[PDB]
Amino acid sequence: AMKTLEKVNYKGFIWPLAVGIVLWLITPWRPGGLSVQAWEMFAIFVATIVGCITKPLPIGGTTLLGMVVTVLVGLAPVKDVVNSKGVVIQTGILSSFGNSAAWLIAMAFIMAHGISKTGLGNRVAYVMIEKFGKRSIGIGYAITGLELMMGALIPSNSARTGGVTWPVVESISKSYDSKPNDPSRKKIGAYLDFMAFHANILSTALFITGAAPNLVAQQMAAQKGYQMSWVSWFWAALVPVLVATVIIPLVIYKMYPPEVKETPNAKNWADDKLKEMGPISKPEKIMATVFCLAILLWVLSGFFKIPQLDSAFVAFLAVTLLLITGVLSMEDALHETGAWNILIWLSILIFMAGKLISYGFIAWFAKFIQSEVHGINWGLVLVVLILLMFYTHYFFASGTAHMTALYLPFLTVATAMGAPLGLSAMLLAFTGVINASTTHYANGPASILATTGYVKQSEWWKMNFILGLIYMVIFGIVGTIWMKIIGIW
Amino acid sequence: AMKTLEKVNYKGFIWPLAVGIVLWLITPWRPGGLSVQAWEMFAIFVATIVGCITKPLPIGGTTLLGMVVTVLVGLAPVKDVVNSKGVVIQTGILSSFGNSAAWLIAMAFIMAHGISKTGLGNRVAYVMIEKFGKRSIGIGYAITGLELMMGALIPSNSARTGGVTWPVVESISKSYDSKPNDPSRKKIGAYLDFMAFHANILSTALFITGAAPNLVAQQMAAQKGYQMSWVSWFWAALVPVLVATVIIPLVIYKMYPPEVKETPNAKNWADDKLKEMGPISKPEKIMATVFCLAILLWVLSGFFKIPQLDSAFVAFLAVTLLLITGVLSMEDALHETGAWNILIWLSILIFMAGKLISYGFIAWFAKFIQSEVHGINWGLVLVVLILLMFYTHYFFASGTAHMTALYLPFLTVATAMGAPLGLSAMLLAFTGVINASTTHYANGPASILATTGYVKQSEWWKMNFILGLIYMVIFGIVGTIWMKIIGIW
Ligand SMILES: CCCCCCCCCC
Ligand SMILES: CCCCCCCCCC
Ligand SMILES: CCCCCCCCCC
Ligand SMILES: CCCCCCCCCC
Ligand SMILES: CCCCCCCCCC
Ligand SMILES: CCCCCCCCCC
Ligand SMILES: CCCCCCCCCC
Ligand SMILES: CCCCCCCCCC
Ligand SMILES: CCCCCCCC
Ligand SMILES: CCCCCCCC
Ligand SMILES: CCCCCCCC
Ligand SMILES: CCCCCCCC
Ligand SMILES: CCCCCCCC
Ligand SMILES: CCCCCCCC
Ligand SMILES: CCCCCC
Ligand SMILES: CCCCCC
Ligand SMILES: CCCCCC
Ligand SMILES: CCCCCC
Ligand SMILES: CCCCCC
Ligand SMILES: CCCCCC
Ligand SMILES: CCCCCC
């Protein structure tokens, strides 16, 4: 018996629509050397992002709407178009949900549901509160150190986030009664969410085995005659990453403070709650075993490249084990909405960014940069290249496509303007790492920790912009001094 | 606070496991001319189906488990493997959820949720009960006639089912208080579910624009020198389809009777309920408009082949309209479990069948048939070919791959054993149509109407086997007499 329609934010359609429309009417006056379909896809993508901002039809709905409009105005098919030789010359909106990152994140949400159902997350939370609970910044630094230690083993940031630290964040927040999409999110949950994201950034920056784009940078620098190694990257990123570990958390605590700042009796409270939770149970032990097994497969995935260890099949396998074991039914995994919502909208955004890359937008931007800056001292050239490689990730959603597309061209321009090779390589790599401090779709950890409701998106974008300025200053200046020190030039 | 694990049917793992194991140990003694990977994939597929039967880890769980085992023993990657020329020589478990049929069915489940929420389904149900409510077989024949009329326009059976008649079935069942997965399913819901499936079969058989496999048969017969036309197919399938319309419902009513057989006062009851529902509302009017628009796009999709009318993008578009209009939020579409469950398990089954087709199983079966039957009167040859083209669809899940793979070879053998061309073509086409009376994954309508809980799977398979024998008798004998009558030979 439904009487009245649901409440929809129609005002939020103004800025997206308008933006799109204007760019569309601008199409004939496009920057030149560019294709009509490219500019149209750019306009639709920008309007979709402005919608994700103004939040009409929450991100799933507006992403579906942007995909629909993409298919209507003739920028994308529904089924992949083949060249009669098997090659897929055009992808479709259906060939977008077969993405590894989105399915990994969904299965990780499901594993997190299992951790929350068993009672393991809350036990871990009270343990961490007994250890470093008081002075919540202590909790933030502990999660930062945990992520840093895990960076050396787990080569997938999306896993390090949705499998280990996002559950810990959720549990610690639910022990403080910090629920999402509620004015009670500001207690401790939002601070911890943000700090988890930025600790994931730091860990990705410290170890070359912290993410894929770093490996892509390695392959490229080897293409141009510079061999990045686990020890060199580490010895170069140690100092700047320590400076960041010391600063970034402090400015987050000063800018986005944890409303609940002090817990003078965390020890007794955690002990009381644990003892009230009774001894550890069988489903909790099984979930712990499955979690340790998944972590083991993830850390082995760095030495053995094998389909059985794709870092997503591992999540499928853990979920399957939870199903055949009992701690997780199938209905428990079916109405875990976050999984399907993120599947939908992340897949759609990645598809639209891929269409931006294929239609010849990024390549034109790269040629423009290559033909614009001609005579300058290589210092300003490197500054400009870092700034561009930073603020171009607003038009990407993978982090690997960004590098494959813009790392070799910008590095080439730098080395051609007199800059040294190792410095430019490592700087553009650190920049491709800290790019994540731009958006809510920049990577897996952001697409996870921005949509949990603990942190709004306006605040997310603003604070990430500021912290990106800070990251660029830190890495550029400090790491340049550091690389001049240790024989990199 | 979870204490005890969930209840899992461990006994149901015996038959699948055993089966698999045995076939695996049989591998060295495989039929010959076959590949090891092919026989292993066959074993895993068969065990997965036996699991879907015995129901450990409901179909979603056992399909996930079969996919996991597929990836573990080295039969499928997780990411598509390319040949360095762009061609995809091996598909992955992730490149399986980008399927048009599964996403169409999911979006149709969502549209059905909208129809049930608005109050439109119940109004339609009481209308149909006022018209042909008494003598529930009247309801079955009305739904049959509706599906038959829609066959001439909507060229997608999955849509005709999940968009029009599955909602009507659900509403009429919920007006009789027939809920699924309940001993109250036998009242009227199961009979109507079965009858809807078989009416979809009949409509697919009557009009060549009733499904894709019929178009595939058309293309093939044109390849071999026989031009199927909308008027010829219809004039040949009229008589047998009338015989089926008269018989099949009767044997279903005699074999699977609708426990509630008589409703002597349907008129007054429907009028009372309608008047108690008040005049038609605004959300109902909007859902009706969206439904009519989707039906219009679906019927236009037969004359204009355009990505904007893919018969799945239309469901995406209807859902998007319901979102931007208000009658359907995003949370309403996120916890619609059936959509995601069918996505999962149908995609996985289609992927495994595609692996059966690529590894060289179906092609070997076809060569075996081509090299086995050599000297026979073409009548027994056609009998054997119809039987094989019928009972090979247990190893397929699309209905189009089946035809593309086995229609031209069997038709070739028939025409080479003396049989006439038009007769063999039309008979194998009708057989590719009635193949759907085999399984729960044979097509979209079956994968929909078998998993709704109104009809079990054991009963489904048994009754579909019997009705397939009956369909083969009817079509073969009657249609052969009919084609001999009208100048087809
Ligand atoms: C004609 C294209 C106008 C721009 C499309 C706006 C898309 C809205 C997505 C929320
Ligand atoms: C050109 C981008 C304009 C985006 C404006 C977003 C305003 C959001 C107000 C809450
Ligand atoms: C748990 C996945 C381990 C699978 C082992 C695969 C070994 C392949 C050797 C060829
Ligand atoms: C010496 C080249 C590196 C300088 C990078 C400075 C970036 C400034 C960010 C605001
Ligand atoms: C060694 C492979 C045996 C096949 C097992 C298949 C398991 C599927 C269970 C649903
Ligand atoms: C290939 C043999 C399949 C056996 C299936 C038996 C099902 C038993 C259900 C009670
Ligand atoms: C509802 C969308 C109908 C299709 C728009 C017109 C496309 C014409 C492309 C030539
Ligand atoms: C003349 C032969 C026509 C084919 C008859 C098919 C009968 C199938 C019997 C099950
Ligand atoms: C001529 C400069 C225009 C650049 C617009 C494209 C980058 C957003
Ligand atoms: C006012 C609702 C508009 C919906 C977006 C349409 C995009 C062309
Ligand atoms: C380049 C986009 C900027 C993000 C918002 C900045 C608000 C100060
Ligand atoms: C307790 C026996 C279940 C084993 C399941 C393994 C399926 C490959
Ligand atoms: C060699 C005899 C036939 C075996 C058939 C195996 C099942 C397709
Ligand atoms: C060749 C497969 C036949 C299976 C028939 C199943 C009847 C319940
Ligand atoms: C030009 C619009 C800025 C937002 C980028 C996604
Ligand atoms: C959140 C993962 C905790 C596992 C403890 C063994
Ligand atoms: C357990 C993974 C081992 C991989 C050996 C190739
Ligand atoms: C293959 C997983 C075995 C676990 C059964 C309890
Ligand atoms: C009853 C199991 C059927 C096996 C063929 C798929
Ligand atoms: C079930 C669809 C009903 C639409 C009536 C106009
Ligand atoms: C509410 C539907 C509007 C679509 C055309 C702008």
Author numbering:
A (entry chain A), B (entry chain B): 0 to 488
What does the paper say about this structure?
The mammalian SLC13 proteins are members of the larger divalent-anion sodium symporter (DASS) family. DASS proteins typically have a molecular weight of 45–65 kDa and form obligate homodimers. Each protomer consists of a scaffold and a transport domain. Structural information, along with cross-linking and computer modeling, indicates that DASS proteins operate in an elevator-type transport mechanism (Reyes et al., 2009; Drew and Boudker, 2016; Garaeva and Slotboom, 2020).
To obtain the structure of a DASS protein in its Co conformation, we screened various VcINDY homologs and chose a DASS-E protein from Lactobacillus acidophilus (LaINDY). The 3.09 Å cryo-EM map of LaINDY determined in the absence of substrate shows the transporter in its Co apo state. In agreement with LaINDY’s apparent mass in detergent solution, the map shows a transporter dimer. While LaINDY’s topology is similar to that of VcINDY, the relative domain positions are different. Compared with VcINDY, the transport domain in LaINDY is repositioned by 13.0 Å towards the periplasm with a 37.4° rotation.
